[PDB]
């Protein structure tokens, strides 16, 4: 089969970059809405006997884009494609992954089921909120890591990285922080609400590393505790920058040295209203995974380099 | 089990009307959206061992209401309810029911499959675009009719109904038109585009009967053809009035005697900007079907009276 | 994989014609019945890793041919074939496609489910009664059209086709009629029972176009209404000619100029007892669809020519 | 729920007797055929919230009866019944239960899958050809035994039963023969083709016991071998008497003392043309099984008495 | 229906205690092994129309107990029970819940799938390793907490609990520790390998709280780090005490004040060879969940008291 | 794709022999157990886009080996292999294939279902206890025969085979012996318990042929009956030699001329403690089936030669 790369309405810029690294052109698909706000999908080329890849990120209008993804997957399945792969840099409803309330839903499993009945055979995603979402599917699921690119940014941009500290803004983020600290051979701390800090922090550069920042109610309160606790400068490094609601107003009025995110969510608009925001490119990692999945090579090689 | 009636964000007024006819109160559910525009559903009462009935219409913002419905169904299924029934007065994506294009989707079947994997056991809907959507499910599906209420309106409001004529604005609507005409003993006509009229029409009160009006393009060119053909006055009777886009601007600048719709879609806002719009209450037919499904009575009795 | 063409008991002549156009030979299968009237299927060649195509029409004795088809599909699936495609020129139980009665079945969906659990991956059919039966399956379904061959016959055989009129014998057949009329730039009419005619007809050659004729209770009554309404000669063009029951006795005692059908159902025996019956060959359209599905070409090209 | 007993076109008499033993009336269902030989099913009462039982035997026109059964099960399932039980005294396609040929089907598993996807929840059958057809299903399957009635008939009718012999006409029927012989405390023999006899037989009454007799090509050659081997009189006892093909011509021209069968298949017509045929009533056992399944009693009690 | 309580080979003592709180007798089931070490299950009562509950913990020989559970669930499903619930205090293969290696299995999802196809409808478990295993099922899953009983033990036994500290032996156990600290209004610490401690712990009683201890390689190294860091006495509180391999030899040769575990795994043999081990009874929490699930009461009430 | 041969813990010697006939090396997989006796599976090569074959026999610790098989199948399915085939020379739980008791399980169907949800696409086995287990799967199942190798052994080793007799130790084994007798043109006998013998036996060499011997409470008592009935010497030929429990002590204390088995179960340890045991190599038949399934050749050719 031949790679047929398709792009949804969300994050059109990343799909163009992945096409460039793969050395191909995006497929002909027109995705608009009808008068009554119903998704319209018009694929403009034959997907018969092809390896269709669709890039759709859980950003912007989550529900509008999610239905767009399911209609595109189902259209390519009935149009007699060979395999259909959903490339989702940010997984929607990933924070609703367990039932710790009375009648709470598990919306991550509902989205997993809906992608399965549309007809997707493979899933490629980056830095899932819970790694266990891989078990919500009966199909192969790729969970790429942005950590090798995060480590590269720290070494080149922060000069004092050899004698810095790494801070976790939440109790559940200690797994991510401890892995990064060992790779840099530095110390680490942890911040818990209900604000308590456990770690030296004083008179050293502190880096806040999390997986996502929706409204930045965290990290911004964490930065105040870090500056009150003796740290000189504070850095914030994140993978998925949603920056919804106040968010930008909190970052613009905070004392972060820099806020660093990836390409998983469109950052072009947010970067106009915040000079602290910096972006790490991940289109190289996504293009390599699509390349190796198509050719039947080892994706495990990606978890050994940048 | 006990009836537990829930209402989604869409069409809150009909759910209250159905609750009054059933003589109960709506269940405690809070449906908001998070900062990143993700649906939040919080059921505030035990649904364990209950007959849950969720009323959600495919109107307004379709994709956000549809994802609202699936989260509510899945939450009630995992919360150990006895049965879950989706009451959907207007079915979303009902116009995409076949594949007559190159790589077209069938989004009616995708929506059908999503309701199945959420965990719905029964579907109650009214006046489907295609009756064959009943076969898109492997569960019982109820297809109610607004025709008995349509015929009741004609007999009381139009005085010349004994010598009127029903006009079909399209070629695919001849099934509805001929059934109505035979039930009234009056003649019928038909209008086809690419605009042609077959039927007397001249010096007679013409009634345009269709199942739906989205942008009212068809019921506007048809009305102009009817007034140019000799009909004194033109009436339009519809079941699902979406009235999206121009729609209202076309109805206000038209020569309809009246435009008549049902409760399936909220008409309170549209009736302010158009005096030609009239509403037929259908909350009694929905309440009776919910009542009879719970009590194990014959729903076929509904198709013999009003 | 290699095409392996198999033929069921029904319509052996079309399978031979399709084999000739494809330039191959029919596979070795022996289908008889045991003493207790149970279907016996004996495939006499290896189907391992092959693209199996089974041609079975819903004609003759429906239930014995339908069980024949399911046994053949299941035998080829367990025999490790690559893909199995059911080519069904006339779909059985296509008229039971909805539930508009008290405890009516939907037998079109039951037959759809049986073909799925036998192991079919693709369905190729022509001129379904309802196009929505495509959504009764979760697999690709091809719905071919006999209209390009219908229009070709009219142009060469009826000399007055430039000033003729197409008549719909029922209210639900107005979709086929209006599409044909626009493609010929001529007018159209419509006949409804409970018998009333709308259209000129008078002093014009009327053509009755329908999708199928089982007992010819319709068209035969329509022709009488057309001859009493001023039409000179009446033609009838149909896709699936079952001609069961009286049928032939009604056609022989009618005033049709000609009755025209296709190859979907065996017409060799019926043509002996009726001289008005003419046949349109469709073995080229079926062979092209089989050829293009195997080669991964565009079947949409078939809906642009003859 | 309430028992709703339905009867298919096959074996109306057994259904009437089962209704009599249960003290109820058969449900209102009309099952005829259309002009093109398609099954028509018209249930004439509400099955909503009921325990529907359908009695259909695999006899006569096997395929038409099987389609009838599937259509009835699906109609009762979609019509919102509580449970649907298929009571099948003789299972169709039970002899095709394994793949011992090149591309042979396993039609028993296909029938099992079709019954599963129609919507049946329970299966009640008597004396399956292979007991593993119980494992062909994912639902409960009852396999009743006619052996107690066979033993009762042997005791009351044959006077010399205390010093008789029991003969198996095939190598695969040695299990039934050994079980019956042990229950009667008599000896046993076996007959194999490719005819060889292993047993005394000489100067004693020999009883041929099998599970079914389709064409009676066996048992007749077995009877000739037994009469040539020194046995005085030969009896034949069977469970399912199909008697298709020559069958009756072979029994009338044979030297059986009596041929004894059960009610699983209609026997009145065959009993008209053969004086040797005798029938054992099994309606009591089926009625008891239905009664105990409805009331949630122990069906295992039936395998301890008559 | 009626509660039918069944017990597997593993942890026979807890099943007896749960039966006593529910005020009933355990069901009659004999579970032995054949000569070739295959599980034999012999239920000695009618489960027809009953609410069957089976108590089986993932301890001892995991694979023999897991196959025992599936055979009991499947036997009770085919025996026409009403509902089947698996009560699993310790879930097997809970630590293999994600794919973070080259070709790693996710054996938690395989066990989830094998419980689904056996026929279980509900799962009751306590303190899952990952809460997300709830989403590995499409059925309701109860995740009980042993924390309220853990808090009761600390207050009753440790006198210095008002000025103690809670220590996490791993980076991933920070979620449990921070929640317990807030409930007691005390401080907390964290220990990470690759052994580094963050927190005071000097001159105060330190409590190590985890979810399970398999070989006690952790907690034993953590205790050495705590005692050399200035802590006075060290306590270890765990939920699932496996104590496999050396385990006991490490606890007997350590400086724990006490090792406290729950009833999820049999502890009677371990406490003979270790005086430091203490058991917390949870048979009241399991009995209440079983009682409330059967009666259709709120299980959420259990997460507000002891 | 490429053949990737994997071996489980059970029967490492047969896998090596099959690898040699196929001319390849076994795949890199390490299978051990954790401290708490849970299966660990670590594949050391890329199975991506490969035809994976796993050889695992139902011997030794059945439950440990069965869970090992499912973990290996599921790991290779999620690792994006092309096809996964389970080669099982001896099928676990094959004797529990029907429900002839009150609440008996059918554990052969449970094992079939667990192999289906792990992700296996093909099953290769030898001499199933019941041939109908092929219908317990919805996937192709190969049922190889050891009979051609059994016939070869008799002709080469037993000199009196031309005037010998074949004895079946059970009523259910008459199918095997009658087929073997016809291929040798010799006589046959049968032994039934509740011990009675039918057949000459006297003054001739008797061969006892069965499918398996677990504990030899079967042939051993049959051999005693044969020697007291006049047979000169007794041979025992079996396919699956389990030899569990007493087994060997009964064979060592019996009067068998020889006990002959196959490679389906490891025999190396048994032949140390029994000189009567002889082994027939079947690694050539398994290698040919694996070779032909991969290459898409006819497996039916194997049932015409050795
Ligand atoms: N899009 C969203 N925006 C804000 N909150 C969300 C969103 N989706 C889910 N949530 C809520 O946020 C909570 C996330 O909790 P989390 O910090 O992940 O707990 P833990 O750290 O124990 O996993 C969930 O309980 C969920 O109810
Ligand atoms: N550190 C890691 N090394 C290798 N794989 C990892 C790692 N972390 C997570 N994974 C997961 O393991 C999977 C390995 O991909 P897979 O296709 O099995 O590799 P291969 O091509 O060698 O079979 C990836 O999809 C990834 O999600
Ligand atoms: N004119 C009609 N009369 C009766 N039923 C109809 C009609 N039109 C459609 N139906 C369908 O028939 C179904 C009858 O409901 P059902 O529960 O089967 O009736 P009962 O309660 O008698 O079993 C309805 O769900 C409806 O969708
Ligand atoms: N007028 C039409 N033009 C194109 N396709 C049509 C038309 N009418 C119906 N169809 C449906 O569209 C499908 C197109 O086949 P498909 O394999 O999707 O095309 P492609 O090979 O270009 O992907 C056909 O199976 C047919 O059923
Ligand atoms: N001799 C036998 N005794 C009991 N059951 C048998 C026997 N032979 C076969 N069976 C099977 O065992 C099943 C027992 O039915 P079941 O509903 O499990 O009994 P209970 O009502 O006691 O649970 C029957 O359906 C029958 O098919
Ligand atoms: N703190 C908590 N409060 C309530 N429920 C919780 C909590 N933590 C987890 N849960 C989960 O919520 C579920 C509530 O059970 P459910 O049957 O929904 O209760 P109800 O009967 O009120 O609907 C439990 O199964 C449990 O797994
Ligand atoms: N005597 C026999 N001859 C041929 N096939 C047999 C015989 N006995 C059993 N079989 C079954 O028939 C199957 C034939 O395999 P299959 O893949 O259909 O062959 P082919 O490649 O010729 O289609 C085997 O899997 C086997 O289980
Ligand atoms: Mg979380
Ligand atoms: Mg339409
Ligand atoms: Mg129709
Ligand atoms: Mg047989
Ligand atoms: Mg873990
Ligand atoms: Mg057996």
Residue numbers in the entry:
A (entry chain C), B (entry chain A), C (entry chain B), D (entry chain E), E (entry chain F), F (entry chain D): 2 to 195, 205 to 316
Question: Could you give the paper's own sentences about this structure?
Answer:
PRPP synthase (PRPS) transfers the pyrophosphate groups from ATP to ribose-5-phosphate to produce 5-phosphate ribose-1-pyrophosphate (PRPP), a key intermediate in the biosynthesis of several metabolites including nucleotides, dinucleotides and some amino acids. Although hPRPS1 and hPRPS2 share 95% sequence identity, hPRPS2 has been shown to be less sensitive to allosteric inhibition and specifically upregulated in certain cancers in the translational level. As a rate limiting enzyme, the regulation of PRPS is very complex. hPRPS uses ATP or dATP as pyrophosphate donor and can be allosterically regulated by inorganic phosphate Pi and ADP.
Here, we find that hPRPS2 can form filaments in vitro, and the structure of hPRPS2 is obtained by cryo-EM with 3.08A resolution. The twist and rise of hPRPS2 filament are 30° (left-handed twist) and 63 Å, respectively. The hexamer of hPRPS2 had D3 symmetry, there were 6 active sits (ATP and R5P binding site)and 6 allosteric sites in a hPRPS2 hexamer. Here, we solve the human PRPS2 filament structure with ADP binding in ATP site and allosteric site 1 and Pi binding in the R5P site. The ADP in the active site can interact with three monomers, which means hPRPS2 needs to be assembled properly to function. ADP in allosteric site also interacts with 3 monomers, and it formed hydrogen bond with regulatory flexible loop (RF loop Y94-S108). Each interaction site contains some identical amino acids. hRPPS2 hexamers are connected by salt bridges formed between R301 and E298 pairs, the hydrogen bonds between R301, N305, and E307, and also the van der Waals’ Forces between R302 and R301. When incubated with allosteric regulator ADP and Mg2+, or ATP, R5P, phosphate and Mg2+, or PRPP, phosphate and Mg2+, hPRPS2 could form long filaments, and the mutant hPRPS2R301A and hPRPS2R302A lost its filament-forming ability. The enzyme activity results showed that the mutant hPRPS2R301A and hPRPS2R302A almost lost its activity. K99 in the RF loop may be a key amino acid residue related to the allosteric inhibition of ADP.
